[model samples]
Target chain A: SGWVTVAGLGPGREDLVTPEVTAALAEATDIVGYIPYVARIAPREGLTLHPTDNRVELDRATHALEMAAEGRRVVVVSSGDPGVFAMASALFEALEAHPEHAGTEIRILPGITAMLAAAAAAGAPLGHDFCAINLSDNLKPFEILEKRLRHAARGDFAMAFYNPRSKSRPHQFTRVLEILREECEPGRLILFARAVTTPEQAISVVELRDATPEMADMRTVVLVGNAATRRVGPWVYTP
Target chain B: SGWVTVAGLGPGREDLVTPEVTAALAEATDIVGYIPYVARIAPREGLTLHPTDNRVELDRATHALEMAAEGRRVVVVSSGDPGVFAMASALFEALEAHPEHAGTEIRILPGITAMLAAAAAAGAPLGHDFCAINLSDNLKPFEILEKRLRHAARGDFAMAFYNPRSKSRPHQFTRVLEILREECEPGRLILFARAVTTPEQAISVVELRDATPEMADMRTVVLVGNAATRRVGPWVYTPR
Candidate 1:
């Protein structure tokens, strides 16, 4: 049996890819990833690429495992930290469901996540304890998301909002922000980092009142630092 | 007039140090850090090092500012993410107190804190919402720490415990954990990451019963992930 290495390519930067991920990629004869993630990496010699759309997560994972079972080193790439809202869980879940590939060895390599990069850019808004939540009501219902939000706010935990404002889900962020305002203080710092580690990257620090829906988009990750998140000059601090 | 860059060195690993931190260090001509931190990055060229014991917090800031006032780029380093429980607040407090240093341009670069590194090593146990509280009662009262623990438990938020057990303040972690146990379930996942990013680094994942006072020390960062923190084989997942 061969090994299947699942790697996070980081938010968007090639430099942020961990050494372990690079080593796995070098060893892999076949690479399977989301379409965009597959295009992000440089095309290596003698490595086959299998790219899929967002809807075929299980399919991609199964295909990679099948390739690995055939004694081929395979790498499944995810953006940002793969363990956080990425392909790691799906891969594991698929593995559990498909016991036929149990003998194939699997390894996970971590990378710098978007939230961490955004927090770094905004000056440690996530230095302390924080929570990351996806606002999309795809697999999970809105009520579950709301419950998590309420719990997060009550805990005064820094919040990293993923899938914040998508094209079809424009109102989701506003609703979540309203809930967050009720649970958290109004003066809490809000960090909006869009397209992090990319050419079109943008970061801004605003208060709850200024964090309107217009300022957010699907490409953005919103960091609502805890009550301790403070504005020191142009930067925000979490203590 | 010169710039004062305050960079977080991250939880003891040079590789985990962000590029921005390295850039700030490269630009600075002088470095001022806690005695232990200064020793970690020793013997650099063209940089004056000012190391001090853990006393006289304001004085260290002043000295760094003085060097910057003399037209030298100054950097103040702190371990385990400066903003979390490090020198950034103290330095900024010093800056605010002394209006004379208003002309000094100050910048703070974030670091990869021990809590995050520890959580990562423990299989994304910090993915969900969480709160961090320092158990040391040096600045805040022990009652305050207890209250935060209780509140964190009630909210079902993951908790990262810093300064869990120091030399003289041994009972602080025990007291806090006792309070946590009162409000939290016994099956809660407690991950202890010691000396993260260092060669001596070690990690432990246990339940509340296992995270006893005897298991922790000063170098350990105790992560009490949310109620959702669960064991899937050897890995823990704190749901986002």
Candidate 2:
């Protein structure tokens, strides 16, 4: 009948998208997501695409719920794993505000998240223990980011950063580098992977001392390796 | 051409397995992995399955590299994401020790990791900042685990625990629970997802106060929610 599925479209490649998500899209009567993600879906005879703007996550989620309530099979797509700083929680948050839609059939389908794809592209820097932190301060305080960074560094956990830098938050990542410099050694390994799994993919590795804030942008996912992480042949892997 | 591709087969379901991994398996002249993971691949002519026992990761990785050097298409299979506490690092470590195989074409294909699969199956409890910790003391010291636990807890980070409990490390997880209780509140949500994305899947969510050591085992991936995580209807999620 009707349901809402929040699915991950993987990073940027067709092969990276899971078969489960592909099947979900095939069955979806309406697809909703941010503009680029919605544009990834091919137009079909029976399907409608709702390409919304950025920062409208709650609105997009609510629209999906409303559509599903009207007996439409809606798929809300995210660039990476929906549960990881993506659309899954936004859908849940919308569901909470509109408790009447709680009965809607909902499922979260996992895919290759950006950090793992980036880690794979640069070798196994995240092979050991790691943490994923969204560097965007739009929803959270800057202090929280600094606190989590210190704790992750003190815990010796490798870290993956999402939304590392954007036009609006240009200065914050510079401060982030400064915090890492204080907590980690100068020779610590860091990787900047942009447009991963796509034709435009770029991978760069530099020590903490050599890393500049400009190396990261909205398309980048930054990976900071643990102390044990190093170059293995042509690859950088942590063992 | 001879090469080694470390591919993750996802958790268990056939649908969850990526087409990239399936294509890799189809072209592989030899497949190497732990017994069950290797068994997931179909047996066919010109394909050899080298299913070894656990704890022989380095050996298996070496064997894969050796086979690739002999001009064989090798695919090293891992149950979840190969890069997460699995064969990817072991393969890299093996290549490091056997520098001769450094020339071998190697690729790491990411897959749906266990924690992500479990989180999807149990709602979005990992919807915010999260940390993944391998609770196995096999490679690292127990003190390190304790220290990481304290730091992750103190940071109020959502946590995913791999190899959470086992027959040999029964006491460790009990101690883990004690440490968590000391750091988190009694009402903190904890989920035990066993054999996630499989037919044998079992998911249970309990408050920190009601959880017991026996609730988890080797097959389980434990998820501890941050302070912001809570239940909305039948789902659990963390809202910013």
Candidate 3:
């Protein structure tokens, strides 16, 4: 009789969280997500928190389904929009493996994704046609990422990169920069938005020629503007 | 003295609107936007609503800037995320043309865009890497649209298309479908979501072979899944 709701907590701000997501949390008896994301929810008397480690998305998703099957109102939380490189797909993948949970009622509530939040902070670097690419190698190979980057640049699409760099794969972003330099002009604009919308938020805009490998990390969302992107006054934007 | 905040109201639902945007609306003395978006805001004791016709984005943005230059707090509203094919770019473009108003304060608060909302309603079709393209010819030519579509297909990216079809350019979407067929398999899934998150929301999933141009309109956001996209029970998703 209970249901599961996958909600997005947005970038990092309380105000960025949608009211729909807030309502779902209020009705939930269980909250599930990665450590930091689950920590965002305030502890209440009736809600039980289930915080898991990284790379446990499938386990967490299956657990939510199992909880829902037992008539517990469950909510799975993701940092950004659930549908955009987040938990929504993982939940479906888990359901595919466990067909018995197919009848479990589910809802996906959209949130203010990190890319959009970064673009807003940077003054609309994604105003034109754009593509969102996950730079993390967990899903696909480096060849596919390189090919997609080339194709995206060749088609003149503004690009947003999630999970641009991490401690494990430090050198991949350097290669990414080299590929971008080959595909785009040196004057092309690139933005590094770290911890956007949070108290420690830092944003920097640099020309591709001036960009270095150390500018991005796991907490950063990188934005590369099209040929038309430029700075007016104090803002960087794509016109 | 005053500031201009370009805010996105989200797709349609009130709960989807961010609290930041709600706070901006409460602080605004002037609300400016297209007719429908402005209509979403209620008239208050000290607020003035300036609703204009479609395709006047630059004019509306310039008006917001002018009002803000006169010490009035102005909020230019867009239905979805302001930074995504919305007033944020237009406002910056206006400022570029008129450097005199460069000193005016401006902020862009993000909102739940239509494609994300539509994807949520119809399952996670865009669950992986994807591209968002505005299919309206008002910005670029058909040749560019065709080339982008081809490149997107070549890269095997799931795609979310805005302004897919209108009364004036009914044939463009047909050509789009033809180009898609040339690039993708016949069994590839395509979803048409009309007026997503609104009361009139309608969603349909079909394969490339069964897709028709009439399946989309101005209010629709079309999603085409990648090669690996498939259905598990009632949901469509691309595995991580």
Candidate 4:
């Protein structure tokens, strides 16, 4: 069987794809990913695409493994860096459950994540140690999410809030910001990056008090820099 | 004057140099950096290399400015990401101090930092929110170092420790680790990554109780992942 290379496409740009990733994709015969993720690579020719719906994570992982087992070079695409809150872990979980696929070589190609892209666009707000948390209470309970938030806040770690204020998950980000305000100083730096790396991208550096629901959307990523995160005129830095 | 693009060369590899950085360097006439950092870049026919000793921070910053002021494209090389604890801040400091160079255009090209490279090689020990502190105590006082350490610990942030133990500063890391052990858990992940992205590179991921002074060197970067850092078999992850 040909090896399976799991790669992250990076926020939402073809230019952000690493050279290593392109080389791997060039050698692959099939690509598997979410429908939107698959659509992003529509320009590539002569490759079979296994696009999945929003919910069928396990099914997609299994399908990619099956394709790999059938001697086709397969790639499971994840947006952002695959190792960070992406498909690599899920694929590994599937592989661990089915030890028979242990013989297949699996490599993970890291890409520019939304966090890093957002950080760069916002002028290095994540220069220090930072944590990323997804507010989508799908797999994890809200209570666990709250606990992790509290722990991260108590630790005063710079935080990157992902999946903030989706269509159905409206109140999630507000609650998270409230928790952050309660734990951290009122004047802490908050960076909101929406549609990062895309033409429609928008970035705003605000304080904890200014992050409201109207300013957020599904495509937005919120970075809560540590106490040291400061604005040096137009640029923000975490010292 | 031609615009100056300050690019980070990363820990020590040509491939680790980002495409954006490569493009920036290609546009520059002069490449100015510390000796070791300058050596990492591949030779280009037309580019002039101006290497300086490690101690001459101001001189190196001034050289780039002078070159840029002369209408020559220059790239001030910084190891690791330029914006963080590198020549970018120093360059900006010099620019602010000398207003004559105000019209010169400057841009920063980010690269994978030593801490990030080390973290990747050591199986993601720096997966959580952490801070990086230089333990050199040469430019900054030891009292300031202690305060930063205490502040990071009280905040429960992980630490990426640079210049942990030099030959002249043998007991510094030990002293810092002692402070960390008192506040943080003894089983906290401590990763020592030495000579990263180089042929002589070595990485060690151990607990606080297991990390020894002998395993670290001047070339090593020690990452003490946060309380949320956990190990599953040989891999470590900072819980998001």
Candidate 5:
């Protein structure tokens, strides 16, 4: 019987990929994911690659389940940790759509998520209690976003924001800066990390008062520090 | 001319350690950490291992900083992501006490934290929006714990809890279960995962009403599903 493995490809570095995921990818008869993630996998003789466009997660997941039911060893790839805003939940959602695939053998292998990698490179701005929220409006409304943004700052929780800038809504992050200015002191530290773990990686740290909307893009993960975050030597860390 | 690197070893697997962390470990002249995590590293001729007892995080951090001040390349080993309720904060906490190490070169190398590994192995119960809390009770008051627990559920977030059970309070989890019961429905599913990503791993998904305190230990991590969490055959997941 065929089985499906949903694996995380770490951030952008092959060296960061876990051996567990490496093994799953090598053993797969077919690989499916969004285009760039599928492009990361080396083309092998026995492996058939299926790459699709963006936001087709349910369709891609359904394709994997169907292939596995037909006795094909399939692997679905997602960047960073598969369970962290990635393909793992989408896979299960797809499985629920096709109840007949309930007995399918499926597994999710963890990877080095971007927030962690970004936090690492930027001196553990997430060293204390924190929460991760996606800034993409695909999940919730802007009002809910403002609430969480205010509450998270009021709750004194350090926060890691994914997809801080979207091609659809360019002003999302400007509003974020305004909210931080409202809730936190101007001297509060924020990190703008882009393309972490890749050759193009760039990290910048600035106080909330000095930050602007131009600092972040789609690939950037913005970490807002609580009141306790500060700098020593070359690093900005939350105490 | 030396530095300190606090690196996460990634749940509990040799292969799970990142290349960045492995390089830091290999280049270290000294390895400093708690007993078990230090033991994970193989002893080498040029490396001096400084393994301390539990609850001495500040002291360990102090010693590592002092060693680095003397030009020793020190690596403090944390079992999971150092930034997630682990050594990163402790290191910075200790750094505050010693103003001389202000010029010290330090870095935190991230790893596969326990929640992600447990969520991965159990099939992504934390697939959607989630929160991670340390229920260890040493640093947090019970009142604060309950508030966060209640707020976390009210926020409709799935949660991954670390150090749910310790020798200090075996019944602490019982109290947690009670709070969860109050905040969630009886049918809410939770997973008790012990020794995840290791050979001794075992995991079980049970409804909140049936969950017992005995299921968790020092090695266990408890994951509570949000409102939309459910089962797909043998796996559990939260809908995105």
Candidate 6:
């Protein structure tokens, strides 16, 4: 019998990927993931790579399952922790539909997620009670996003926003900023961390009233601090 | 001039610690942290270790800052990511109190964190929006913790709780279960993951009605699933 492993690549740093994940990739006969993630792995003599486009997660998972069922050691890759809105959950969703391969052994190796790395870069803005919410209306409805935003803000919980702005939904973050303004004060600190740990990294800390929708792109993860959050020198943090 | 780096050691295993953190440890002339966390590092000839008791975060940070001011490369450690309700903020709190040390070079290196490790071990019950709250009344009042729990449950967000039970607060987690029962359905799923990624690792998944306060201890991290979360074969995950 064969097996499948889901591994997280961390944010964008090679060293951020755990040794457990690196060992998995070394033993895998096949690798499956999105374009940039698959590109993160090097081509080897005994390995076959399957890089797919965005939004084809179900097809990608099925292919890995079929390969594993054929006695191949398949490894699925994800940026950040696989279980955190990444490929691990998607793999399980595919398994629900393909119950015949339910016996395939699977393991999830965690990684340094984006929000933690971003929070570190911003000097611990998520030091207290916090929520991590996906801003994309991909699977859930927009109403769900609005409701959660209101609740998280009103509860005075620090929040991290993922997939905040996309090409298809440029104005979506504007609505997010507006909703946050309703519950939070104008002096509340918010940070936009883009391409963290990479050479193109840029981190900006601003107040809610001064924040603009254009500040966030596909690469950015936004952190909104609680009422107790503030700046110490250049660091935006919560105590 | 020397600097201080507050780095996270990850959950429990040596392999899980990031190279960024490992590099900091190597460069550190002195290491300061809680008992078990500092014990994770090997004793080398030129390295000095300062392992302190729990609830002494301010004392620990102050000592590390004092050493850094004396031109020593020091690293203050936390088990999970230091920035997440850990030593990074405490280090900052010390910096705020002693403003003269404000010019000290300090860096916060992120770690894998326990919640992510626990979530990975038991599939992704937190595959959607989630809240992370420390259940201990160590730093904040219990009333604030109660308010956040109500908000998190009402939003139907997946949740992770740290330091759920302590010796001083024996009945703290029992009250937490009561609040969860009031806000969530009897069928809501909850997970108790203890000592994640260690040899003593144990993970249990049960419905809210089936949970007891005895399931958690100081070493445990509890995860509550969102409404969309479910079980597939042996894995519990929320669809992305």
Model 6 misplacement above 4 A: B38-43
lDDT of each: 0.72, 0.90, 0.90, 0.71, 0.85, 0.88
Tens digits of per-residue lDDT for model 1 on B1-240? 677777776677566666667668777788887757656544567778777664327678877877888898989887755666666666666666677886677776655567766765665566555566777647655665565566667766677888887667766777777887888888888888888778998888888866688777888988887776676655666433
Model 4 deviation from native, Cα RMSD in Å: 4.1
- Tell me what fraction of the real C-alpha contacts between chains A and B each candidate also makes: 0.15, 0.84, 0.83, 0.04, 0.61, 0.80
Segments in model 4 whose C-alpha atoms lie over 4 Å from true places: A42-46, A53-59, A128-133, A137-158, A166-168, A183-185, B35-46, B53-59, B95-104, B114-169, B176-197, B221-240
After TM-score superposition, what is the CA distance of residue A95 in candidate 6 from its true location, in Å?
A: 0.8
Worst 10 residues of 6 chain A by lDDT: A164-173
Query: Poorest 10 consecutive residues of model 3 chain B by lDDT?
Result: B51-60
Query: In DockQ, how does model 4 score against the reference complex?
Result: 0.22
lDDT of each residue in B1-240, candidate 2, tens digit only: 699999998988878888888889899998887767666567788988876665536888888888998999999888788889988998999999998887889989889999999999887999999999988857687989998999999988999999987557668999999999999999999999999988899999999999998999888999999998999877899989
Docking class of 2: high
Residue B166 alpha-carbon offset, candidate 1, angstroms = 3.9
DockQ of each: 0.28, 0.86, 0.85, 0.22, 0.61, 0.82
Across B33-69, the per-residue lDDT of candidate 3 in tens digits comes to 7766656567778888886665536877888899898
Clashing pairs in 1: A10-A80, A131-B129
Encode model 6's per-residue lDDT on B1-240: one tens digit a residue: 889899988998988989888889989998887767656567788888887765536777887889999999999888888988788998888888888888899999998889989999998888899999998856678888888999999888999998999688889999999999999999999999999999999999999999999999888999999977899877899875
The number of the candidate with the highest DockQ is 2
Q: How would you class the docking of model 1? A: acceptable
| Candidate 1 deviant stretches above 4 angstroms | A13-30, A55-59, A98-107, A124-129, A167-170, A197-199, A227-230, B19-27, B34-45, B52-59, B103-107, B238-240
Give candidate 5 regions above 4 Å deviation: A137-139, B38-43, B54-56, B169-171
User: How good is model 3 by TM-score?
Assistant: 0.98
| Distance from true location, Cα of B25 in model 4, Å | 1.1
lDDT of 2 at A163: 92
Docking tier of model 5: it is medium
